[PDB]
Design an enzyme around this catalytic site. Structure first.
Site, PDB file in Angstrom:
ATOM      1  N   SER A 197     -11.709  -1.671  14.224  1.00  0.00           N
ATOM      2  CA  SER A 197     -11.275  -0.649  13.282  1.00  0.00           C
ATOM      3  C   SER A 197     -12.378  -0.445  12.214  1.00  0.00           C
ATOM      4  O   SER A 197     -13.500  -0.147  12.584  1.00  0.00           O
ATOM      5  CB  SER A 197      -9.954  -1.064  12.671  1.00  0.00           C
ATOM      6  OG  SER A 197      -9.348   0.039  12.017  1.00  0.00           O
ATOM      7  N   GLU A 324      -3.423   3.880  19.401  1.00  0.00           N
ATOM      8  CA  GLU A 324      -4.084   3.608  18.149  1.00  0.00           C
ATOM      9  C   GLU A 324      -3.267   4.118  16.957  1.00  0.00           C
ATOM     10  O   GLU A 324      -3.177   3.416  15.950  1.00  0.00           O
ATOM     11  CB  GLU A 324      -5.489   4.245  18.133  1.00  0.00           C
ATOM     12  CG  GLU A 324      -6.413   3.777  19.263  1.00  0.00           C
ATOM     13  CD  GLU A 324      -6.960   2.375  19.039  1.00  0.00           C
ATOM     14  OE1 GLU A 324      -6.409   1.642  18.179  1.00  0.00           O
ATOM     15  OE2 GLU A 324      -7.934   1.984  19.721  1.00  0.00           O
ATOM     16  N   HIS A 437      -2.820  -0.534  17.376  1.00  0.00           N
ATOM     17  CA  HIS A 437      -4.129  -0.664  16.786  1.00  0.00           C
ATOM     18  C   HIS A 437      -4.221  -2.101  16.330  1.00  0.00           C
ATOM     19  O   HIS A 437      -3.364  -2.558  15.578  1.00  0.00           O
ATOM     20  CB  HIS A 437      -4.228   0.273  15.587  1.00  0.00           C
ATOM     21  CG  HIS A 437      -5.599   0.400  14.998  1.00  0.00           C
ATOM     22  ND1 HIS A 437      -6.667   0.914  15.704  1.00  0.00           N
ATOM     23  CD2 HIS A 437      -6.045   0.198  13.724  1.00  0.00           C
ATOM     24  CE1 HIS A 437      -7.709   1.047  14.885  1.00  0.00           C
ATOM     25  NE2 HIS A 437      -7.360   0.623  13.678  1.00  0.00           N
TER      26      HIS A 437
HETATM   27  O1  LIG Z   1      -0.184   8.727  -0.586  1.00  0.00           O
HETATM   28  C1  LIG Z   1      -0.151   7.580  -0.257  1.00  0.00           C
HETATM   29  C2  LIG Z   1      -0.769   7.011   1.007  1.00  0.00           C
HETATM   30  C3  LIG Z   1      -0.632   5.652   1.240  1.00  0.00           C
HETATM   31  C4  LIG Z   1       0.098   4.742   0.284  1.00  0.00           C
HETATM   32  C5  LIG Z   1       0.626   5.327  -0.856  1.00  0.00           C
HETATM   33  N1  LIG Z   1       0.482   6.675  -1.059  1.00  0.00           N
HETATM   34  C6  LIG Z   1       1.390   4.577  -1.934  1.00  0.00           C
HETATM   35  C7  LIG Z   1       1.215   3.056  -1.838  1.00  0.00           C
HETATM   36  C8  LIG Z   1       1.370   2.620  -0.394  1.00  0.00           C
HETATM   37  C9  LIG Z   1       0.240   3.221   0.512  1.00  0.00           C
HETATM   38  N2  LIG Z   1       0.811   2.951   1.863  1.00  0.00           N
HETATM   39  C10 LIG Z   1       0.480   1.639   2.493  1.00  0.00           C
HETATM   40  C11 LIG Z   1      -0.464   2.060   3.585  1.00  0.00           C
HETATM   41  C12 LIG Z   1      -1.457   0.978   3.894  1.00  0.00           C
HETATM   42  C13 LIG Z   1      -2.435   1.461   4.963  1.00  0.00           C
HETATM   43  C14 LIG Z   1      -1.711   2.164   6.122  1.00  0.00           C
HETATM   44  C15 LIG Z   1      -1.644   1.192   7.281  1.00  0.00           C
HETATM   45  C16 LIG Z   1      -0.468   0.199   7.222  1.00  0.00           C
HETATM   46  C17 LIG Z   1      -0.958  -1.213   6.860  1.00  0.00           C
HETATM   47  C18 LIG Z   1      -1.956  -1.812   7.852  1.00  0.00           C
HETATM   48  C19 LIG Z   1      -2.098  -3.304   7.545  1.00  0.00           C
HETATM   49  N3  LIG Z   1      -2.567  -4.170   8.629  1.00  0.00           N
HETATM   50  C20 LIG Z   1      -2.782  -3.901  10.006  1.00  0.00           C
HETATM   51  C21 LIG Z   1      -4.122  -3.931  10.538  1.00  0.00           C
HETATM   52  C22 LIG Z   1      -4.292  -3.740  11.972  1.00  0.00           C
HETATM   53  N4  LIG Z   1      -3.256  -3.541  12.785  1.00  0.00           N
HETATM   54  C23 LIG Z   1      -1.923  -3.493  12.286  1.00  0.00           C
HETATM   55  C24 LIG Z   1      -0.879  -3.273  13.264  1.00  0.00           C
HETATM   56  C25 LIG Z   1       0.463  -3.203  12.887  1.00  0.00           C
HETATM   57  C26 LIG Z   1       0.802  -3.356  11.504  1.00  0.00           C
HETATM   58  C27 LIG Z   1      -0.198  -3.577  10.553  1.00  0.00           C
HETATM   59  C28 LIG Z   1      -1.623  -3.662  10.889  1.00  0.00           C
HETATM   60  C29 LIG Z   1      -5.670  -3.761  12.685  1.00  0.00           C
HETATM   61  C30 LIG Z   1      -6.769  -4.431  11.801  1.00  0.00           C
HETATM   62  C31 LIG Z   1      -6.747  -3.849  10.390  1.00  0.00           C
HETATM   63  C32 LIG Z   1      -5.382  -4.172   9.683  1.00  0.00           C
END
Ligand SMILES: O=c1ccc2c([nH]1)CCC[C@H]2NCCCCCCCCCCNc1c2c(nc3ccccc13)CCCC2
Ligand SMILES: O=c1ccc2c([nH]1)CCC[C@H]2NCCCCCCCCCCNc1c2c(nc3ccccc13)CCCC2
Ligand SMILES: *[C@@H]1O[C@H](CO)[C@@H](O)[C@H](O)[C@H]1NC(C)=O
Ligand SMILES: *[C@@H]1O[C@H](CO)[C@@H](O)[C@H](O)[C@H]1NC(C)=O
Ligand SMILES: *[C@@H]1O[C@H](CO)[C@@H](O)[C@H](O)[C@H]1NC(C)=O
Ligand SMILES: *[C@@H]1O[C@H](CO)[C@@H](O)[C@H](O)[C@H]1NC(C)=O
Lengths: 528, 528
Positions: A197, A324, A437
């Site tokens: 990623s 993904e 992903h």
């Molecule tokens: O306008 C907006 C847009 C976003 C957001 C806000 N406001 C307010 C705050 C919350 C934030 N939302 C939290 C989103 C965080 C990023 C989105 C992805 C979800 C978290 C991913 C964390 N870790 C994972 C990772 C990977 N695979 C996964 C698979 C399933 C579940 C979590 C995984 C692959 C390696 C990288 C990390």
């Protein structure tokens, strides 16, 4: 002693760790840069000052300051990605797993974690390098780098927060591996950097950046590429976000110096608390502070560099997973939830496409919608859900990767492409999410070889061939041992599926959808 | 037959080779020593036992076992220096190019390759002697010698690995030329030994060593001299490195006999795999196994020998290139890379000076830094890069050579000094590297006379005057044909630039910097 190693930075003392009823040495927490704290926050990393005495490398280091996922408290599916050590701005360390007995000069693999450039840790259980180091006899290194505003706040023109410092952290750890891995039995002329990623995008960025090219031999990119739409921004956009971050914390915004000084007085969690407020659009799969096309780390735009062959020429092995996009929809689009099959209404599909291609006008949103809708069955909830999943994955990961691979192969010295579509028997995430992903990582790191994790025997066998493909590729530039993974060529464009069934070779991975995302839509948005 | 020659060692059969639309004879791969294998590894060379029958000298011999450069796979700039034949410990051979028809008694030139005493091959395309033999009517010889631990592992006191054996290999080939070159039409009383970098240091070492002096007439030294800081070590340091090499391969270290026996059971590549781990300091331009000031090959310290005139008195022609240090920084200092202009930060400049003068205390590092920094513009990246380049070149090549030439000239019978500063039109290395270490060789060997290599007409003309200067000097002790290259004298210290412009004569080559490196810094390090 096998656990004592003398490096150019000082002596370091490791610890012996058990692995599959045997043992290896681990040197955890070796510092490669001065702590980027106080006035050094936002600054380029400085090399670690040599120390006298013995550095205790028996325990994992702190993880960098980052946003922490609390959507499913205690759910192993999500917590396995969260920091499992205390967070600290003092986080620039690397970890080394060395076969026992100590090799003399063997293949080195350096892992670069993903996490959208706003999170990630080198210490996670899925990144434990002992299984791969042991099973394949490679010296396995995992580095760390600053993420979020700490690693990517960019005020181009200022030397205090120039941007890309998190990539400079990665580069410094690679400089350290180049310079010191020989003492751990690693061959500095045979290092493969690999990452998933944002880590895979990073690997691609070091392949492009003139300043990083000489520090490694070959590269592996997993579900990420340098040209991904979420992986970089212009210096103007980077500036606008830094200013907006300052505006959210009541900073004086009259000069870069005023803004940076204010941002430096804030406690880490104050920056993380408002980080998500600076995104320009309501969007999904977009992160606030990412690399900037600054004219230094990246001399010109990523696309012209790809077009002109301005990049390291070597062999690469890369690929993508079948779904993904699913977790980004779970976490950010209406109608999706962890405990339901998430059948999507046409209304939620449409608000989902708007969220997925944030930068598009109405005509562009209509072109995506038409491309992914089966009009003989438009209210089919399963089809709407799956169509949205493919849109997110194709736009954010697959098509950007296919564009990078076709551009790279024209000048490179060897490409191996894969499509990972095995859904693990013990997956804790719902079925609708498919091959998620990040879920090929556990097979790359060999987790299925440990009985307690409950994988099937065929999953263990799949893990073993992937590890041997990755290590054999790291050692020779070819995943095959002298059933064949064919070379991806400009003409044939072959790739293999990576799963528990007998290898099948195919051609032109998602060509139909990628001609839409890489050629038609961009032309459409540029004219209208 | 013109291709059959009867030597004191046996008959040898050459092969006819084309050169600039004509032809000459080449006798490739003539053995001059018994293969130094098995129990002979590390031992002084033994003369080749005469053979009956005809020795097939139609193809190049194996190259000695050495570390191989893999930094730029396939890049011609770096691969032109790597072994182009199979490696083998069975590598003690020499090559002869003889004008056609066979001369009766003409000027002989013996080439000694460089490569920091850890690498080098007599068979490289830039060392092809047919152009020089043909154009100047000289019998051109290129010898080989063991490098790395194989040629220089030194356990003073032991007769099994006494050290300096690689220099004894060179001496044996010279003994063979003295004894047999008459049969090839060469004049044994008119042989000039010439070499570049470690080869130029070697030429200077045979001029000093009582045991080698009578085997040649005159000498040419290119970018190297005997007193270079990287060209020799004390017997104690040589011992410490041999012991550390053994320690890296888990050898019994209780006695020389135990250590040597263990080192002899190792396959060649096992020694090469850990060779770089025995350097005492983090450093640049330093090689593990080099000549030792042993009291035999060198009766006393190199400096007292120079001071007392204890050396062969004859004529010498020598010189340096403008940017001797650039490739050592590319390959070993942070911030330098092949594909960028390599502008250096003040931080990288400073870690660069530490790497360049490894043996210096803090006060010494401050004296070098001050001497090379323009304090009105300390953050100028180009100036930092160029300053570092000059530090490496002045300390490692230029100033040691200027000290040797001023000491030599006081007792010698004629000195001609040059400064080669022509950057070739077809250079594949980046611009910041300038006139690189080793790049005058192609002009000395006449490569610009072959159209396919794409040099300019003025480069061909430069090559022709250099070849004629070298051969005229080899024949008479004066590069001039009866525009004048003036003699370098103690008083005047004149030298010429060697490039495509009209000859300009100057005086006191880099005096300002060399008074610093040859008089002030050593005094400084000795008092503090
Ligand atoms: O306008 C907006 C847009 C976003 C957001 C806000 N406001 C307010 C705050 C919350 C934030 N939302 C939290 C989103 C965080 C990023 C989105 C992805 C979800 C978290 C991913 C964390 N870790 C994972 C990772 C990977 N695979 C996964 C698979 C399933 C579940 C979590 C995984 C692959 C390696 C990288 C990390
Ligand atoms: O602590 C340390 C110090 C060094 C090293 C290690 N660790 C780990 C292993 C790698 C080794 N680094 C490889 C360095 C090899 C020697 C440095 C010089 C670069 C290679 C030179 C090879 N051939 C060249 C030669 C000449 N000119 C050249 C010009 C441009 C490029 C290469 C040239 C002139 C004749 C001699 C060979
Ligand atoms: C290294 O640190 C760990 C825990 O912090 C401790 O158990 C161990 O004794 C330490 N080793 C030494 C010799 O300091
Ligand atoms: C890689 O490069 C080598 C030499 O530079 C060449 O022989 C080989 O065919 C190349 N392989 C590919 C896949 O381009
Ligand atoms: C010398 O060796 C070469 C190749 O090894 C061969 O072509 C040639 O015939 C040989 N000459 C004789 C007479 O053995
Ligand atoms: C070289 O030596 C000869 C005689 O020994 C002498 O006549 C001549 O002047 C000397 N040349 C130089 C440059 O010392």
């Amino acid at each position: 002693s096998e656990l004592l190693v003398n490096t150019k930075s000082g002596k370091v003392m490791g610890t012996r760790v058990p692995v599959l009823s045997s043992h290896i040495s681990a040197f955890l927490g070796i510092p490669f840069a001065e702590p980027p704290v106080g006035n050094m926050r936002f600054r380029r990393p400085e090399p670690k000052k040599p120390w006298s005495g013995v550095w205790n490398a028996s325990t994992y280091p702190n993880n960098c300051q980052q946003y922490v996922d609390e959507q499913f408290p205690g759910f192993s599916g999500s917590e396995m990605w969260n920091p499992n050590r205390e967070m600290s701005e003092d986080c620039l360390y690397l970890n080394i797993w060395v076969p026992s007995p100590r090799p003399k000069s063997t293949t080195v693999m350096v892992w670069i974690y993903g996490g959208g450039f706003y999170s990630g840790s080198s210490t996670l259980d899925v990144y434990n390098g002992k299984y791969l180091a042991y099973t394949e006899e490679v010296v396995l290194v995992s580095l760390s780098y600053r993420v979020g505003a700490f690693g990517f706040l960019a005020l181009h023109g200022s030397q205090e927060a120039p941007g890309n410092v998190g990539l400079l952290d990665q580069r410094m750890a690679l400089q350290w591996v180049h310079d010191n891995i020989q003492f751990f039995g690693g061959d500095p002329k045979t290092v493969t950097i690999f990452g998933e990623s944002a880590g895979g995008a990073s690997v691609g960025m070091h392949i492009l950046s003139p300043g990083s090219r000489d520090l490694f031999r070959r590269a592996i990119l997993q579900s990420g590429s340098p040209n991904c739409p979420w992986a970089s921004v212009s210096v103007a956009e980077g500036r606008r976000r830094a200013v907006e971050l300052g505006r959210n914390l009541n900073c004086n915004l009259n000069s870069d110096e005023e803004l940076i000084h204010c941002l430096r007085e804030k406690k880490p969690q104050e920056l993380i608390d408002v980080e998500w407020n600076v995104l320009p659009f309501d969007s999904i799969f977009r992160f606030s502070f990412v690399p900037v096309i600054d004219g230094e780390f990246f001399p010109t735009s990523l696309e012209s560099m790809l077009n002109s062959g301005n990049f390291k020429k070597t062999q690469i092995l890369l690929g993508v997973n079948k779904d993904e996009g699913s977790f980004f929809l779970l976490y950010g689009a209406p109608g999706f939830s962890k405990d339901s099959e998430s059948k999507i209404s046409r209304e939620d599909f449409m608000s989902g496409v708007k969220l997925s291609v944030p930068h598009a006008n109405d005509l562009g949103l209509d072109a995506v919608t038409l491309q992914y809708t089966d009009w003989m069955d438009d209210n089919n909830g399963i089809k709407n859900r799956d169509g949205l999943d493919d849109i997110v994955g194709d736009h954010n990961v697959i098509c950007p990767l296919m564009h990078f691979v076709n551009k790279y192969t024209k000048f490179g010295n060897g490409t191996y492409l894969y499509f990972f579509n095995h859904r693990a028997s013990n997956l804790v995430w719902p079925e609708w999410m498919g091959v998620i992903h990040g879920y090929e990582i556990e097979f790359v790191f060999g987790l299925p070889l440990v009985k307690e994790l409950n994988y099937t025997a065929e999953e263990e066998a799949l893990s073993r061939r992937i590890m041997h493909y990755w290590a054999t590729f790291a050692k020779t530039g070819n995943p095959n041992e002298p059933s064949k993974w064919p070379l991806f060529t400009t003409k044939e464009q072959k790739f293999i599926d990576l799963n528990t069934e007998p290898m099948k070779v195919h051609q032109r991975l998602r060509v139909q959808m990628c001609v839409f995302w890489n050629q038609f839509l961009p032309k459409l948005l540029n004219a209208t």
